[model samples]
Target: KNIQVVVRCRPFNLAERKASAHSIVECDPVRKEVSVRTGGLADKSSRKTYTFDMVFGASTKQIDVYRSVVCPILDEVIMGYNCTIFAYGQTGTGKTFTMEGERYTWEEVPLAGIIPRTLHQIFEKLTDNGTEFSVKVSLLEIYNEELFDLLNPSSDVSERLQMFDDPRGVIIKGLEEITVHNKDEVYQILEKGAAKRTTAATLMNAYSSRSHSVFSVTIHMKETTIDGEELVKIGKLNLVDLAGSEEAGNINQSLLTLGRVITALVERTPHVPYRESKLTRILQDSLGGRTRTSIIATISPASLNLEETLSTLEYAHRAKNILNKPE
Candidate 1:
């Protein structure tokens, strides 16, 4: 299954809206192409275009986005495939806005982002299908190449975190996996975990200020054949909110290995740098395996973020060429 790549442009934040900068990016709503101009209305030479599997322009609603891009992937997961959905972009470009929404009151939660929405749909849909299923959630944060458990924040960063690859896939030892059945339980765990995540001063979110987070959900479905032989269907969903680039040196460097891997794939040369970074190493399978994945590449429309925005577009553009076990 090939990873589905989609690019989304977020409306300017309040601060950006008042910055007196005009939009330098435009998309073809027609499909996977986005064009960028660096110096306002003049420089055609400074213009470049990139394409992907899909594109979502600004003014799109959270609900509509989730429905179009994510719901179908969830279907594959329920059928026992490994899948992932990650938001990638520069800092303040709305990666968090799309994957994990801005906070709000309980009564105003109709606007919650993909992570919470996925939890609800999984349980509800599975129950309707009348299948016996078990779901377990594990939340982890990767900061400056270090691993920390948001669920149990008190754990030391040094020893408890380790990555090992087994017959199944890459596994992080000593990570807390909480058993969850209902949506309420899942949300509670996420809410609590979010509060404990290592937070720095960029946004209310406990993530994405030079750090990335993974909210992985795995389900084991018990099934029986007509002959009464019991079997299990294991599916996984990796919801990642990757750190946005505050600077090309910091966030961009971390993604260098990722770029190397994808660029190789784009060139069809057959070498991937999974060994280059811990994030890529752990997700090597997801990006290269039977793992069905989707990329929600977020970008800002403001002119102030020219360099950051350009870097993000280039990354998303290269990622579109990554193919998963051809049709």
Candidate 2:
């Protein structure tokens, strides 16, 4: 089934705007001028003139909207469908922050971050309303067009490094599926996966993810009652954290793996360099042919990030137009 898409832009920090109902107050505020346009108004036919003030705030209303909009759609998917949530943007644009909140005290955890919060919401609904559900999770990384199973910790890093030579098809190996029962179990599994994820700081942003990571949670659900009537549903939730696309000049030798992976994705070559590294092969499905997907493009509002922002937007535009069929 096709999944519903919800776009959320968040504040750089909590101190910005947590709660406030407001709208855009002014246009071209920095330019110190208002943009005016002449247009035909539908209200004119009805003969009415209405004036209202506009307000703006820094905080995001994702939590409220998710509960009202995204939750219901996802709930249906859980009943019997597939869904994917993937983050895509340049480095330091809050992609990780939008999906996974910063490491904060339990009391301070924000619900706006989609990853854990979304899982929690799903589990809650399932516990209250679902009959029987089983969750299986797999974490993999794509680096230099190669795939590595992050969940399989003991596997040799060298052996895990496999690639897809065919642009038409990509093969991934070393993936592990762990069955989970509750929220805590998922959390623990994610924690383990995070530790194994390849990350490094760069000029763009600290804690920048250096690999394309796929954390997939598959749900096999069956409803059975006393009468022995049963209905089954298979649902998959893929939480993808993609590495930032960067210019070759800006990236150091150590980060070249990320650069090559981006090149492969943008070029769409017949021979994908997935074997060059472990990360890329694993995310072959997400990149092109596979299931229905959503890409969360994160951005920073700061003027200093103009070039990065423009580049990020351009990438998103390309992704928006991409056409692919399941393999």
Candidate 3:
């Protein structure tokens, strides 16, 4: 699978500003451009341009980029086959914000983020086309190289692949696949998963995600005909919010886990270190070996974060070079 990539740039937070207090920077999402001001004297001028595919600036209220870019592509995939959507980025860069919505009243707000949005879109199209289908969802967290069932109370990584069968319909394991009559039910399930997720604050963002979270929603659609014949269409939507990658030198007890996880992710050997870290092991298919995946790289616009910004860009460049086996 060839995953599509999107880059989101926004203003740096106060902490990020403080971290890079010596540079000038500006980001314009409307133009999908970032301008950085290098060191200068009275008569000197310096600026650099960074371009991205889709830009969301301070004015764009919604943080769901996947719906805008990835969803359309996924919609095409589901028209005839299956597809997956995953979000990856450093901590405090809005991965969770993009995957899950922040907050809104039950009836007043629309479905949050790419996962729910995609689910709703899928069902809407199916219903409009007068097609019948079954959908299932699974939620899991990867921490310290261990997988924990988010839907289940159990915390065993070994039980990560258990599947359940429903005679009346389809069977799914290590995840919860609920049959739905409409899109509203899908939103409800997303809300439940958001509440169950683990989040914490760090030097980056106040509500930064501290774990690699994967929410997989599988759609098994069987079109019912006037003759009662059925045509099955199987597709998967993976909404992933990865933990922030940190500098090893900045490690603290709280951030050590994230650092270790990042270290394992960057390693390319066959052993690959996925077994060594929960996040990497579960995402082995996405990161190292085989899977059609897209990485949306997010960065701050402050020149003060030049070093960190450069590091992030480099990481993304390396990811672009990664090759995966075809399914």
Candidate 4:
């Protein structure tokens, strides 16, 4: 199955408008294309456009994103398939905003993001269908090539988690998977996990992106027939919010490895370097195995972010070619 890659351009914020930053990105959802203005000294009129499976413009609502992308993937996950959705972009480009929303307080549920919406739909669909099912979720963060379990209750957030690669897949040794009974429990977990995410100040953003997070939900559905025999099927859904797209030291090592893995898969090379990084190793199955995958590449509309926006678009466009064999 071909991984579906979509582009979402965020609207200019207050600072951008105050600076009179011109809009450099144009998204045409009907045509599924994103055109970026290439500002230069000589040729100022040149613009580059890239096409993807889908596109969401600046005005696209959170619910619209959920309906257009996650709805179908959620269906596949319910049918005993593993699926992954990734939010990828530069700093302050709405990666976290797309995954977890800009604001979600304990008492308020305004602008619910993909994770919350997906959890809400899972319970709504399963309970109404009278399926005997269980949902367990785990949230983990990767920072500086180390793993930390965000959902680990007893342990401190700074405690590093370990990974063991077996024949089945890469497993986090002590990751805590909380059984979510309803949407309220999900919000509580998300609030706690969001509080635990690692963030440091940077020149680009106040809370500069430093960590990648994977929020996984595993569902076990049990079916009973007239003969009193029960059958079970398991499915998993992973929502990945990647760190800001940048290259330097060990901080962006996983992102570099991920790009290499994508290139290897696209080129059909003999060696796909899944073992090079922890993030890629854990997502090995999702990238080139049986899991269905989709990418939401967020971008900024102002001219200031044009360079990183173009890079993100190119990377995401290339990822659409990596095929997976779905069981």
Q: What is the C-alpha lDDT of each candidate?
A: 0.74, 0.51, 0.53, 0.79
- Superposed on all Cα atoms, the candidates' RMSDs to the truth, in angstroms, are 4.5, 10.6, 7.9, 4.8
Top candidate on TM-score is 4
What's each prediction's TM-score? 0.85, 0.62, 0.66, 0.88
The residue pairs in collision within model 1 are: none
Clashes (N, CA, C under 3 Å) per candidate: 0, 17, 11, 0
- Per-residue CA lDDT of model 1 for 1-327, tens digit only, reads 356778889888878777887788897776557778866566667877777777788878888789888889888888888877888887777777787665422222666789877887877877877778989988887766767677764553333377778672577888888888677576678676766663422232335467778888888998765777877898888888888754336455667776676565545566677777777777776566644577788888888887877888777767656332222
lDDT of 1 at 4: 71
Whole-structure CA lDDT of model 1 = 0.74
Write down the TM-score for model 4: 0.88
Number of the predicted model whose lDDT against the real structure is largest: 4
Candidate 1: which stretches are off by over 4 Å?
40-46, 103-108, 153-160, 199-207, 225-231, 246-251, 263-269, 322-327
Candidate 3 stretches with Cα past 4 Å from truth are 12-35, 38-52, 63-67, 80-82, 104-111, 153-181, 199-208, 224-230, 247-292, 321-327
- Residue-by-residue lDDT tens digits, candidate 3, 1-327: 354445665555888666756535565666655555655566237665555445555334443564566666566546443444445555666666666754433332442667656666777777787866667777776543334555654432234443233451233354554565666666666555554553212221223254567776667767777787767777665667766654232222323333343434445334434443434334443344333445666666665566556556555545433332222
- Minimal lDDT window, size 10, model 4: 199-208
